[PDB]
């Protein structure tokens, strides 16, 4: 209802934080928010 | 648009030189808008930043604050 | 051939010819126009030009 | 292929441009300078046309050897570090693609073509702006991310500024939240001075006018004409560092000074806040206002919505941070003035409803409490503060200890001799409330005095004292009743005077 677009979506979306995140991760190791992310 | 707002243009441009007939023959050519205060360098901005400083002895700064 | 200055700034602004007719003035920035046919007329006339 | 070696940063501080590193490609910029000489007088041998291919082909070669490769190296390397690093760093990389470019418009003039004075020149400069357009101003990169890295130090190095007075010296409400979401719609820390907020102390001003004013300059002079639009983005960032930042939080810093209004019995707290929000005055609107005055004189090019960043930007901001100090002025005039009202005439039933109609001539808690609560609420800071609101607040509050005149001496309800205890108590509080501080009192407090002397209305002194010159202070029927504000009225017909 209202989780897709905003849980659901991280719920469809969830390695795409992690995946989201590795976008700065060229552009301008990856322990403490790829293993333990809360 | 250019009439629906073209005539929303003039109507306005002239509505304010109603409100600018004021009794003088008032001449409303200057453009000076004043707040409640009245280079050719790199560091000539930093220098206007410390010309700030400068202004941050000046005058006392005195004004009137009340209500 | 005046490469003109940004006033306030200082910085430079860009190229001008300068055009300085029997009574009236052509400041024109000729760039990209390489005529002087309508180049850009910053223009007056002599008789108030300060 | 450097590896980014310290230091990397030490460049963060509230100035300009600073420490390590070059840069080591003007190295490789000098290098290609006298390279560029040296096959310049080559090539200028050794050819038949000119600019091709040194202008044309050589000078693709320079940009295609030097500034593709250690160029967005030194991107890599600039930007791999932070962004307001490269973002300053930006400026002088670019700043020094300027200084050899200026270095190819002399050395250009060591070439003597008028085609290759022509835009192959600018087809050099027009390589010199590729190098800028890998990192081009048509996109929010190279200008709203420098904003958003401009955010960070902005917010950073001026949010935490004035670090215990931003965060914190209240919850924070501290009447933004309270007065002007309720009016325009109490001890929170003690007890010295206006301490770092207030602004701070204009070195704050300074840090963010340093740095903002700084990179404002950076991304002023750095950036195409494209200019007044990002002048009043961050103008209008300093909007909200200054005139919501420090005018409602590092201001509210000085409300948090002004979470000790509503003051009735409580001016210790404001007795530290006077100079709080009155160096808010003096530093954040005299340094802010002409600063900002004359600094944005400059920074108007020649736009008719720059006047839009003076009225509704600046201008709106005096009357708005108007708005926002006088009112507060306006509930810390409440302050004050329910301080001397409320407390100044809290005196017991043996002084302000005294009914010592014969005896009882002296001072009490009309003098304890209006020295006590005016002299040292006023007497503490705002004797010494405001001059920045020198007549608004020596005149304006000492107008409302005139008022509390009005509260306090001549609203002492005491009797036919205890009228003379505010003579000697309201008028030993006249010209005590004319040194407290707030000490516009030696007129209309002195009217108090004199009604002081008519509020004493006893069977002998009722008919012309209280006819005296600012005896009508006391009442047009209420003189020889000028203690009907007592107990006791006039002892014995008070009323036959209107008749």
């Given at each position: 209802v209202l989780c897709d677009k905003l849980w659901s979506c991280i719920q469809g979306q969830t390695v795409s934080l992690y995946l989201k995140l590795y976008t700065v991760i060229d552009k301008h190791k990856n322990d403490i928010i790829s293993a333990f992310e809360e | 648009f250019n009439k629906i707002w073209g005539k929303l243009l003039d109507e306005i441009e002239l509505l304010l030189v109603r409100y600018i007939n004021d009794p003088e023959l008032i001449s409303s050519n200057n453009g000076s808008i004043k707040p409640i205060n009245g280079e050719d360098n790199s560091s000539v901005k930093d220098q206007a930043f410390e010309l700030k400083a400068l202004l941050k002895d000046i005058f006392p700064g005195f004004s009137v604050s009340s209500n | 051939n005046w490469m003109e200055l940004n006033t306030t700034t200082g910085k430079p602004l860009q190229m001008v010819q300068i055009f300085i007719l029997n009574d009236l003035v052509l400041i024109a920035d000729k760039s990209r126009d390489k005529q002087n046919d309508f180049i850009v007329s910053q223009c007056y006339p002599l008789k108030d030009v300060t | 292929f450097i590896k980014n070696v310290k230091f990397k940063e030490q460049l963060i501080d509230f100035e300009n441009h600073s420490?390590?590193?070059?840069?080591?490609?003007?190295?490789?910029?000098?290098?290609?300078?006298?390279?560029?000489?040296?096959?310049?007088?080559?090539?200028?041998?050794?050819?038949?046309?000119?600019?091709?291919?040194?202008?044309?082909?050589?000078?693709?070669?320079?940009?295609?050897?030097?500034?593709e490769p250690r160029f967005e190296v030194l991107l890599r390397n600039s930007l791999s570090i932070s962004n307001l690093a490269y973002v300053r760093i930006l400026?002088?990389?670019?700043?020094?693609?300027?200084?050899?470019?200026?270095?190819?418009?002399?050395?250009?003039?060591?070439?003597?073509?008028?085609?290759?004075?022509?835009?192959?020149?600018?087809?050099?400069?027009?390589?010199?702006?590729?190098?800028?357009?890998?990192?081009?101003?048509?996109?929010?990169?190279?200008?709203?991310?420098?904003?958003?890295?401009?955010?960070?130090?902005?917010?950073?190095?001026?949010?935490?500024?004035?670090?215990?007075?931003?965060?914190?010296?209240?919850?924070?409400?501290?009447?933004?939240?309270?007065?002007?979401?309720?009016?325009?719609?109490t001890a929170s820390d003690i007890d010295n001075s206006p301490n770092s907020p207030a602004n701070y102390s204009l070195n704050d001003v300074d840090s963010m006018l340093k740095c903002v004013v700084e990179s404002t300059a950076r991304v002023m002079?750095?950036?195409?004409?494209?200019?007044?639009?990002?002048?009043?983005?961050?103008?209008?960032?300093?909007?909200?560092?200054?005139?919501?930042?420090?005018?409602?939080?590092?201001?509210?810093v000085a409300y948090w000074?002004?979470?000790?209004?509503?003051?009735?019995?409580?001016?210790?707290?404001?007795?530290?806040?006077?100079?709080?929000?009155?160096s808010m005055s003096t530093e954040i609107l005299?340094?802010?206002?002409?600063?900002?005055?004359?600094?944005?004189?400059?920074?108007?090019?020649?736009?008719?919505?720059?006047?839009?960043?003076?009225?509704?930007?600046?201008?709106?901001?005096?009357?708005?941070?108007?708005?926002?100090?006088?009112?507060?002025?306006?509930?810390?005039?409440?302050?004050?003035?329910?301080?001397?009202?409320?407390?100044?005439?809290?005196?017991?039933?043996?002084?302000?409803?005294?009914?010592?109609?014969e005896l009882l001539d002296q001072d009490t808690l009309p003098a304890i409490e209006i020295v006590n609560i005016l002299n040292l609420i006023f007497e503490q800071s705002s004797k010494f503060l405001k001059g920045?609101?020198?007549?608004?607040?020596?005149?304006?509050?000492?107008?409302?200890?005139?008022?509390?005149?009005?509260?306090?001496?001549?609203?002492?309800?005491?009797?036919?001799?205890?009228?003379?205890?505010?003579?000697?108590?309201?008028?030993?509080?006249?010209?005590?409330?004319?040194?407290?501080?707030?000490?516009?009192?030696?007129?209309?407090?002195?009217?108090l005095r004199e009604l002081a002397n008519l509020f004493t209305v006893q069977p002998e002194l009722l008919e012309s004292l209280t006819k005296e010159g600012h005896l009508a202070d006391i009442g047009r029927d209420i003189i020889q009743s000028y203690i009907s504000n007592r107990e006791d009225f006039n002892h014995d017909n008070f009323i036959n005077s209107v008749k």
């Amino acid at each position: 209802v209202l989780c897709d677009k905003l849980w659901s979506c991280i719920q469809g979306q969830t390695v795409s934080l992690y995946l989201k995140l590795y976008t700065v991760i060229d552009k301008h190791k990856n322990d403490i928010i790829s293993a333990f992310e809360e | 648009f250019n009439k629906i707002w073209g005539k929303l243009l003039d109507e306005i441009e002239l509505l304010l030189v109603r409100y600018i007939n004021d009794p003088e023959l008032i001449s409303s050519n200057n453009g000076s808008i004043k707040p409640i205060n009245g280079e050719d360098n790199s560091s000539v901005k930093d220098q206007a930043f410390e010309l700030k400083a400068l202004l941050k002895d000046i005058f006392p700064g005195f004004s009137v604050s009340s209500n | 051939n005046w490469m003109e200055l940004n006033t306030t700034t200082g910085k430079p602004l860009q190229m001008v010819q300068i055009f300085i007719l029997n009574d009236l003035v052509l400041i024109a920035d000729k760039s990209r126009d390489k005529q002087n046919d309508f180049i850009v007329s910053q223009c007056y006339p002599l008789k108030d030009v300060t | 292929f450097i590896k980014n070696v310290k230091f990397k940063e030490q460049l963060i501080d509230f100035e300009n441009h600073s420490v390590i590193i070059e840069t080591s490609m003007q190295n490789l910029i000098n290098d290609v300078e006298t390279v560029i000489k040296n096959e310049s007088k080559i090539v200028k041998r050794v050819f038949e046309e000119k600019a091709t291919h040194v202008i044309q082909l050589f000078i693709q070669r320079v940009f295609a050897q030097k500034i593709e490769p250690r160029f967005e190296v030194l991107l890599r390397n600039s930007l791999s570090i932070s962004n307001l690093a490269y973002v300053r760093i930006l400026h002088g990389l670019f700043t020094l693609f300027g200084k050899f470019t200026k270095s190819l418009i002399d050395y250009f003039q060591l070439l003597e073509i008028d085609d290759s004075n022509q835009i192959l020149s600018t087809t050099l400069e027009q390589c010199f702006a590729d190098l800028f357009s890998h990192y081009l101003y048509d996109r929010s990169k190279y200008f709203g991310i420098e904003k958003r890295s401009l955010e960070a130090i902005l917010v950073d190095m001026t949010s935490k500024f004035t670090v215990n007075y931003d965060k914190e010296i209240n919850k924070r409400v501290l009447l933004d939240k309270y007065k002007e979401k309720l009016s325009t719609n109490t001890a929170s820390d003690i007890d010295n001075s206006p301490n770092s907020p207030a602004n701070y102390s204009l070195n704050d001003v300074d840090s963010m006018l340093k740095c903002v004013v700084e990179s404002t300059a950076r991304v002023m002079e750095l950036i195409p004409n494209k200019a007044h639009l990002y002048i009043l983005e961050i103008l209008k960032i300093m909007f909200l560092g200054i005139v919501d930042s420090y005018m409602e939080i590092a201001l509210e810093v000085a409300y948090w000074k002004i979470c000790k209004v509503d003051i009735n019995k409580t001016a210790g707290v404001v007795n530290l806040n006077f100079l709080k929000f009155i160096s808010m005055s003096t530093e954040i609107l005299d340094l802010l206002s002409i600063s900002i005055k004359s600094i944005f004189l400059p920074l108007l090019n020649n736009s008719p919505e720059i006047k839009a960043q003076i009225i509704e930007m600046t201008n709106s901001q005096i009357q708005k941070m108007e708005i926002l100090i006088n009112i507060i002025l306006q509930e810390t005039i409440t302050v004050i003035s329910t301080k001397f009202s409320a407390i100044l005439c809290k005196q017991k039933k043996k002084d302000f409803v005294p009914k010592s109609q014969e005896l009882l001539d002296q001072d009490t808690l009309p003098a304890i409490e209006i020295v006590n609560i005016l002299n040292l609420i006023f007497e503490q800071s705002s004797k010494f503060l405001k001059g920045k609101n020198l007549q608004t607040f020596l005149t304006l509050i000492g107008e409302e200890l005139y008022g509390l005149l009005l509260s306090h001496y001549s609203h002492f309800q005491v009797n036919s001799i205890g009228g003379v205890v505010v003579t000697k108590d309201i008028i030993g509080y006249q010209t005590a409330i004319e040194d407290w501080g707030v000490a516009s009192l030696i007129d209309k407090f002195a009217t108090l005095r004199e009604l002081a002397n008519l509020f004493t209305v006893q069977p002998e002194l009722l008919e012309s004292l209280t006819k005296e010159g600012h005896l009508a202070d006391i009442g047009r029927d209420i003189i020889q009743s000028y203690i009907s504000n007592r107990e006791d009225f006039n002892h014995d017909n008070f009323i036959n005077s209107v008749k």
